[PDB]
Structure formats: C-alpha cells, structure tokens
Amino acid sequence: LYTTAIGGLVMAAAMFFAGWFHYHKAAPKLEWFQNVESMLNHHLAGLLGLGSLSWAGHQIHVSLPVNKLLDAGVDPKEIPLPHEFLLNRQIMQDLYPSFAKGLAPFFTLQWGEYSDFLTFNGGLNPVTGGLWLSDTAHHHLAIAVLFL
C-alpha cells in the first residue's frame, strides 16, 4: 500500500506537469483536438482494451493465486509474494496446473487447457461471498479483445 501511495503521488506530479507542459509549453492546435476518429480509435483499443488486458494480466498472475491461497486458509504473512508466482512457475503450476504447459495452448488455439484460471462459473464464491476472481479475469480478457 505504501509503495502504491508513493506511485500515485508521482503520477499526480506528472499530471500537473503535463497540464502546464501542454498549456504553457507544447499546446496542441485545434486541428489536433478535432480528430474524433483518432480519439475513439485510441480510447477504445489503447485505453479500454489494453486497460482491461493489462488488468487480466494482474488478475491472472497476482490476484488469482493470492486470493486462492487466502481462501484456502493460508496465513496472509505466509503466502508467497506476488512476483514469486510470475518467476517460480512451479508455485503457479501447483495452484493452476495449466501453467505446466505454458503459452503453447493459447497459440495452438487449445485455450480450453486454461479452464482453471479462465472459467464461466457464474454466481458467487461460497467462501468469500463475491464473484469468482477467475470469472472476472475471463471477463476482462474478453472485454479487451472486443475493445481492441
């Protein structure tokens, strides 16, 4: 949380800097602003589509394994830190056996193999009372391809 807070403050300083820079320094001309076809093309794919795909990355690598371990009863201060799921394939493979294959199923169009972190269960998790994190990951993945 502390690291995130610091990052948000850094972003804040970038935003105000950008506002001053794009006003007192590099101020866009009207012809730039009136390219609606470009704005929509970049806000739909680059902003919404990539924004969801980037989240479908976190949800699949950090939120899903951590939440599974938390719901399994594991103490929060004993769960492997997020990065270990990315680097140590064994840990992620144990939680989701489909990481034993790799990205091969995706390119081979055998997406089905990934039916342990991308599912259409529907309903609510019986342990935490909230939508399955697996279903949310699949949603953001789909929503992305659509926007892109």
């Binding site: 320094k25 590099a26 990065h83 680097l87 294959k101 990205l103 091969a104 390119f107």
Partner: protein, 218 residues
C-alpha cells in the same frame, strides 16, 4: 532503399539525414507544427544515442558468456550481474550494487547534463572551466556528432565528406541491428530463461526443435 514509404513521409524526408530509408509510418519526423521532444532534431539525436548505447549493450550482454564459457573468466549471463537482483546477483563486486549505482548516477549527471546543455545552448560546455577538458567539450553544430580532439580523437573521417557520410550510415545501420538485437536478447531471455549465447548454441543444434514456436511450450 525506401521501405514502407508514403508521399507524405517523403515530403519531410529528402535523404539528407544519415540512414533515411523513408520509413516513418506514423509520421513523427514531420517538422510542420512540431515541438517538445517530438521535434525532428531531438528524434534523430535520440536515435543516434540509442544506437551507440545499444551497440555497447549488444556487445556486452553476450561477451561475458562467449568469453566466460570459452574459459576466459566470469561466465555470467547478462541478467545475473545485479541489473535485476531477483533474477540473480554476482558475488565478487569491489562495492555494493547500490553503492556502484550512486557513483553511476553522479557520473552520468556530469556527462549527460553537459551533453544536453550543448544541445539546448550549442557550444556552451567549452566556455565554463572544466579541468581544462572544456576545450575538448566544444562539439560541432550537429548535436548528435560532437567531434573535437576527443570524440573524434583519431580524426577518422574528414578525408572528404563522402567518408563521413558513409561512416555515419555504417553506424545508423550497425546500430539499428544492435537495437533489434538488444530487444531480441531481452525477449528470448524472458521466454527461454537462458542467455543469448546458449539460445544460439541450441538453435544450431536442433533448429526445428529449438525455435520460438517450440519455446512457447518448452
């Protein structure tokens, strides 16, 4: 020659710049209504700087292995030096990795701020006293190519403008290949997990069974 070029790109691409193949699909080098760091001058200046850095890296991310495996010494892969501590760290360093970074930051400040001040305010590093080096920090009009008794210390070139122009095309091409290589080193490292040299010495063995497609699963 021209690669994926368009009439619009040619309007602002007339061949002068070293290594101009008219390849500007998005069109960022268009001078008309430009500013900030997207000004054509800064873009070309950065490309040269990237080429020089990439060429040093491209030759540095494979040399510890090509030499270390041969038995010269060291024998580390570019990710196991301390750049990315989670992926490994070398043990025999005369100082702390962060301590080295502290010196690195101070050194780059006196080397990349002086370089910059010579672009913003051309030939401004030759007036303020700098241990007498200032004289060698004058540079020429072109920001990318300084010159002087230091940067061009062996006056390579100067025998005709044609030789300078060929030596500048050699660099922009030996550097666009090095830039594509550095990206290759990182990408292969992430997927395979091994070093550039071992990745080559594996394609050479069973090429069909040792490629990106097979590396998707293996």
């Amino acid at each position: 020659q021209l690669y994926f070029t368009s009439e619009s790109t040619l309007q602002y691409l007339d061949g002068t710049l070293p290594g101009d193949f008219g390849f500007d699909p998005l069109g960022l080098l268009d001078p008309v209504n430009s500013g900030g760091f997207v000004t054509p001058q800064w873009l070309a200046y950065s490309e040269v700087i990237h080429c020089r850095w990439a060429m040093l890296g491209a030759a540095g991310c494979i040399a510890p292995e090509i030499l270390g495996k041969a038995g010269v010494g060291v024998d580390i892969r570019w990710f196991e030096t301390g750049v990315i501590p989670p992926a490994g760290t070398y043990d025999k360093y005369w100082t702390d990795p962060y301590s080295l970074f502290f010196i690195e930051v101070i050194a780059m400040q006196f080397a990349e701020l002086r370089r910059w001040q010579d672009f913003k305010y051309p030939g401004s590093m030759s007036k303020q006293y700098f241990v007498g080096l200032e004289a060698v920090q004058g540079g020429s009009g072109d920001p990318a190519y300084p010159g002087g008794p230091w940067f061009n210390l062996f006056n390579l070139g100067a025998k005709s403008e044609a030789d300078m122009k060929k030596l500048k095309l050699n660099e922009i091409k030996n550097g666009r290949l090095a830039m594509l290589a550095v990206f290759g080193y990182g990408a292969q490292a992430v997927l395979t997990g091994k070093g550039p040299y071992e990745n080559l010495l594996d394609h050479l063995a069973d090429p069909v069974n040792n490629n990106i497609l097979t590396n998707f699963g293996k």
